[PDB]
Write a protein that binds this ligand. Structure first.
Ligand SMILES: [Mg+2]
Ligand SMILES: [Mg+2]
Ligand SMILES: [Mg+2]
Ligand SMILES: [Mg+2]
Ligand SMILES: [Mg+2]
Ligand SMILES: [Mg+2]
Ligand SMILES: [Mg+2]
Ligand SMILES: [Mg+2]
Ligand SMILES: [Mg+2]
Ligand SMILES: [Mg+2]
Ligand SMILES: [Mg+2]
Ligand SMILES: [Mg+2]
Ligand SMILES: [Mg+2]
Ligand SMILES: [Mg+2]
Ligand SMILES: [Mg+2]
Ligand SMILES: [Mg+2]
Ligand SMILES: [Mg+2]
Ligand SMILES: [Mg+2]
Ligand SMILES: [Mg+2]
Ligand SMILES: [Mg+2]
Ligand SMILES: [Mg+2]
Ligand SMILES: [Mg+2]
Ligand SMILES: [Mg+2]
Ligand SMILES: [Mg+2]
Ligand SMILES: [Mg+2]
Ligand SMILES: [Zn+2]
Lengths: 78, 98, 60, 121, 206, 24, 116, 155
RNA sequence: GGCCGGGCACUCUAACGGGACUGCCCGCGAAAGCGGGAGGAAGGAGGGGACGACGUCUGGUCAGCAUGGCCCUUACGGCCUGGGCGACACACGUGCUACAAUGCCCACUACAAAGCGAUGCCACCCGGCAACGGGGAGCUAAUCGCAAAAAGGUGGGCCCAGUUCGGAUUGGGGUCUGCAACCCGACCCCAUGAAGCCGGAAUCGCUAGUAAUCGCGGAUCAGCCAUGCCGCGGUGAAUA
């Protein structure tokens, strides 16, 4: 994919800016999920829209998988 | 001096749009090699006849970029005279290089 | 949305990618001769109409 | 003198000597370099006797490849037969005096290939 | 059910273009997007005098709006004032040398796109549509013509069935290429809806 | 065949350059 | 030689019969061992087979070992599970090709049902 | 072919042996149009001819092209019939066009690995009896005389 | 490898012209026209195009657009951001690649045609296994680039094995575009190498430079899911 830049985002890192600053509980709603696996988030807060609601599930160190909508579905089953 | 590229779309005005320039030749002083028509290359475009639910044949039709060019070995300033006159192109763009 | 649209093509205070070829004489967002800024069917008239120079029924 | 096939254009100029036949800077046998179909263009020479009384400097350009070889067929025996009135006595007779408009036809008409129409069911 | 346009057929032959110039691919687009909004503000304004043509020439940073009519008067006006501001509206859009001209068609009963533009008003005027046709063609074939044909859309009223009104005299061939057959079209917005008219005037075979 | 990529015929048909069709 | 006996054939291609040794890694690793890529896989001395027999099974990973490593990138894939993680839990295209028509090679053969 | 009869194409004579019956053969050997490959195989096969039988790979081509010429056939045209197969006579023409065609598939139906070593390797068989070709023509021929009863309305 | 001071036979170019008309031949009877000679690059519209009567299906299309009517007018209009059109137990039409040894691969080696290039084509060296990148060329292009066409041709290796066949799938890297390729891009390298030994009932295409077959161009395009599409050429059948 990309190789120049952390191909991450910008406009909601400022909400993560304080991932090491204030006190750092949870809850954090994005929309542009294009963000790559934000690489400094332990037991944190997936909170990703997908048309529907924002999806919440854990985000641990191995979890450093791909992006964000990676763990945010958009569909239906069988 | 005398390589001059008579461009254009309109074609019957290039056998005449040049035959008239090559006669500033036989008036100014230049045993001029007449119009050399370097190859036409054409930008044709094919397009679906109907506005919905045709698809099989369409009608093509071309935009024949025509082209010619002129020459000699003799370039006096009375040449410059005629070339500022006798200009009869409806829409036949023409440039000059030395 | 049909008209409020054409002036999304003309404004582009948005990235290079958000841009395209809405026609002039009509708005068809599809099938657009680059060099006329137009449409398979708009064009195909002005031609028969002969309000486009040079173009005419081909063959070979 | 000259000949054409599939817009294969073959300039044929003939001079006497013996066994000399070269084209685009290759000897005609290293030009096709194995292609025994090819060895057949230089065969009006055989039509009435002219085995080796006429060598060949020809320059073919454009058009085919193996059909480029038939291009030297009426490039030869038509620039060649230029002299001798009594010489056409084997080119109209023996069928060797034609261009053959057998050329690839225009792909057209929403077909796949100017004939092969799409499938059907 | 086909009949491709009767001119596109004869567009580089027996009918010279309606827009004569040449432009370099890199710019041709703009020599059109500009080139029509003239035609798209002249047939608009000069409908009054009734124009059959809007031939447009150039070859530099200029213009050549040789607008044809068969009745100038309303084009030039008196002394020259409509035509004077018209050649300034034009350079209000095309910041160029808006060089205009005028014609009087030697016969209007021999311009199709007039004949059409005419009958299509008789339609907007709630008139005998068939009769309109029997006369329109009679107009043309009397003022010297080898053939002539008009064909109306196919309405007249109601809320339903729509037909087509067809009549003609002389001959109007079309698998004949050396044809020279002027064709015109015109709309006609009634309370009912739109109609059309195909104008077919056969001047002569070159 | 015109679908292996990793071949002469592979990249030729797809018309891509690669280790196996560098150029000429 | 990994875990396999390949006999009458080309060392060039023989070594490829191994999961994790392709036609490439057999010529580039043949440089390394410096053997002849055209000689049969039988004409190589016992004292010199051990070119390969100490080489490529040590240059990296392959059968068994590397075989096993491929599935670790998939147990990984139900971390949270990606869209890419799931589509083995449902046996479907993970590049994301059309799962309408075709997509057959990932989910068995046509299990046919009734219609309209 | 309802209007006229359609033209028989006169073949561009063999590019070595001069003989049209030798072009017609290499023709029915060319997959697609690589032609070069088609006449290699054939000429290759004449070389294989020389190896095994010191005859002229030309009469080896004849006592073969006429061995596998079916005398007659069953034109089962459908007039009235639920499978009426009135047999008749084979044309000089069809005799050859079939016989050629037969020899090439009969060659390709053999388990020898190099298409050259095949196409003469039974072009030899067909030549005094024998050969997948004459069989696939023997059958053919015995289909008539067996269906002789329907001679009555031959044509 | 005109690389040339010089030249317009040729080549191709690209304009305006000639040329076929059924032509003198006992076999058509007043006829028309059909034969089988001659010359011709050429014969019975010469290949083929564009062209498609009155009408027909109240066919298609109000989503290109036009347009009467009807209905919505802090919403049936407007913007944004994310999603979707890409879903998958399955059924079809069109296709692409094949199951191979007339074949598949690594070499070198020929031989086209139409077209396209100022956010181009990018010649040529550097880098890199390469995609590509750093650079930097001639470029308004018959005069430089796309470009190298592939079958072909040689010459070498595979020896009927699901294989040096087949390229699916998944793992891993890693490029260009692009604000951003999770959903969803194309490409590249490594490794995985699935179904598939010629396809039931059935069913399509073609008159010859056709079918088959081989690449190439172009449109649209930031890039691209093109195997599609219109083009163009290479080799080139069978049969009536
Ligand atoms: Mg776009
Ligand atoms: Mg030509
Ligand atoms: Mg050919
Ligand atoms: Mg072709
Ligand atoms: Mg009613
Ligand atoms: Mg109608
Ligand atoms: Mg009312
Ligand atoms: Mg392979
Ligand atoms: Mg993919
Ligand atoms: Mg999908
Ligand atoms: Mg895909
Ligand atoms: Mg026959
Ligand atoms: Mg008579
Ligand atoms: Mg007569
Ligand atoms: Mg004709
Ligand atoms: Mg869709
Ligand atoms: Mg396909
Ligand atoms: Mg196929
Ligand atoms: Mg070349
Ligand atoms: Mg640079
Ligand atoms: Mg893949
Ligand atoms: Mg960018
Ligand atoms: Mg036919
Ligand atoms: Mg292509
Ligand atoms: Mg392109
Ligand atoms: Zn349009």
């Amino acid at each position: 994919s990309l190789k120049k830049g952390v191909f991450v985002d910008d406009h909601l890192l400022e909400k993560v800016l304080e991932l090491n600053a204030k006190g750092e509980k949870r809850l954090i709603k994005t929309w542009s999920r294009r963000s790559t696996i934000v690489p400094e988030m332990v037991g944190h807060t997936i909170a990703v829209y997908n048309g529907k609601q924002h999806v919440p599930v854990y985000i641990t160190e191995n979890m450093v998988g791909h992006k964000l909508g990676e763990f945010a579905p958009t569909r239906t089953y069988r | 001096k005398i390589r001059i590229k008579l461009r254009g779309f309109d074609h019957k005005t290039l056998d005449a749009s040049a035959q008239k320039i090559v006669e500033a030749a036989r008036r100014s002083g230049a045993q001029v090699s007449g119009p050399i028509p370097l190859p036409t290359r054409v930008r044709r475009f094919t397009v679906i006849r109907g506005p919905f639910k045709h698809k099989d044949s369409r009608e093509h039709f071309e935009l024949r970029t025509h082209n010619r060019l002129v020459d000699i070995i003799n370039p006096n300033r009375k040449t410059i005279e005629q070339l500022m006159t006798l200009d009869l192109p409806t829409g036949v763009e023409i440039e000059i290089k030395t | 949305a049909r008209k409020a649209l054409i002036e999304k093509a003309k404004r582009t205070p948005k990235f290079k990618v958000r841009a395209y070829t809405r026609c002039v004489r009509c708005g068809r967002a599809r099938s657009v001769y680059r060099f006329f800024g137009l449409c398979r069917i708009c064009l195909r008239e002005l031609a028969h109409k002969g309000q486009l120079p040079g173009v005419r029924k081909a063959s070979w | 003198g000259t000949g054409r096939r599939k817009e294969a254009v073959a300039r044929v100029f003939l001079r006497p000597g013996n066994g000399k036949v070269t084209v685009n800077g290759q000897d005609f046998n290293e030009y096709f370099q194995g292609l025994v179909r090819a060895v057949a263009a230089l065969e009006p020479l055989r039509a009435v006797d002219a085995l080796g009384h006429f060598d060949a400097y020809i320059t073919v350009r454009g058009g085919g490849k193996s059909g480029q070889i038939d291009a030297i067929k009426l490039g030869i025996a038509r620039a060649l037969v230029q002299y001798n009135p009594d010489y056409r006595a084997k080119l109209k007779p023996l069928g060797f005096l034609t261009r053959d408009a057998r050329v690839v036809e225009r792909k057209k008409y929403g077909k796949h290939k100017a004939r092969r129409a799409p499938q059907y069911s | 059910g086909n009949k491709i346009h009767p001119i596109g057929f004869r567009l580089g032959i027996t009918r010279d273009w309606e827009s004569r110039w040449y432009a370099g691919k890199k710019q041709y687009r703009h020599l059109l997007l500009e080139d029509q909004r003239i035609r798209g503000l002249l047939e608009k304004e000069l409908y009054s005098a009734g124009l059959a043509r809007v031939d447009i020439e150039r070859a530099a940073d200029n213009v050549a709006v040789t607008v044809h009519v068969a009745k100038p008067g309303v084009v030039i006006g008196r002394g020259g004032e409509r035509i004077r501001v018209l050649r300034e509206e034009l350079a209000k859009l095309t910041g160029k040398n808006v060089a205009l001209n005028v014609q009087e068609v030697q016969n209007p009963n021999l311009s199709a796109p007039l004949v059409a533009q005419r009958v299509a008003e008789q339609i907007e005027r709630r008139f005998a549509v068939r009769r309109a046709i029997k006369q329109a063609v009679q107009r043309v074939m009397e003022s010297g013509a080898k053939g002539a044909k008009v064909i109306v859309s196919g309405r007249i009223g109601g809320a339903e069935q729509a037909r087509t009104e067809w009549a003609a005299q002389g001959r109007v061939p079309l698998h004949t290429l050396r044809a020279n057959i002027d064709y015109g079209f015109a709309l006609a917005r009634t309370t009912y809806g739109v109609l059309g008219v195909k104008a077919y005037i056969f001047l002569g075979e070159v | 065949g015109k679908g292996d990529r990793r071949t002469r015929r592979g990249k030729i048909w797809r018309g891509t350059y690669g280790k196996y069709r560098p150029r000429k | 030689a990994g875990v396999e006996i390949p006999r009458n054939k080309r060392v060039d291609v023989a070594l490829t019969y191994i999961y994790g040794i392709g036609k490439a890694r057999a010529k580039e690793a043949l440089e390394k061992t410096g053997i002849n890529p055209a000689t049969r896989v039988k004409d190589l001395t016992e004292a010199e087979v051990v070119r390969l027999r100490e080489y490529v099974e040590n240059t990296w990973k392959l059968e068994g070992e590397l075989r096993a490593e491929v599935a670790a990138n998939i147990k990984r894939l139900m971390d949270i599970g990606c869209y890419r993680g799931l589509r083995h839990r449902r046996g479907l295209p993970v590049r994301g090709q059309r799962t309408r028509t075709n997509a057959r090679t990932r989910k068995g053969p046509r299990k046919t049902v009734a219609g309209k | 072919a309802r209007r006229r009869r359609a033209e028989v194409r006169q073949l561009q004579p063999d590019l070595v042996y001069g003989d049209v019956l030798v072009t017609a053969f290499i023709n029915k050997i060319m997959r697609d149009g690589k032609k070069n490959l088609a006449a290699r195989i054939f000429y290759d096969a004449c070389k294989i001819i020389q190896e095994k039988t010191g005859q002229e790979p030309l009469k080896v081509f004849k006592q073969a092209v006429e061995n596998v010429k079916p005398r007659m056939e069953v034109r089962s045209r459908r007039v009235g019939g639920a499978n009426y197969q009135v047999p008749m006579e084979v044309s000089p023409r069809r005799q050859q066009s079939l016989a050629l065609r037969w020899l090439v598939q009969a060659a390709n139906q053999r388990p020898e690995r190099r298409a050259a070593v095949r196409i003469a390797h039974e072009l030899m068989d067909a030549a005094e009896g024998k050969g997948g070709a004459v069989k696939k023509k023997e059958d053919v021929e015995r289909m008539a005389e067996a269906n002789r009863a329907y001679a009555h309305y031959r044509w």
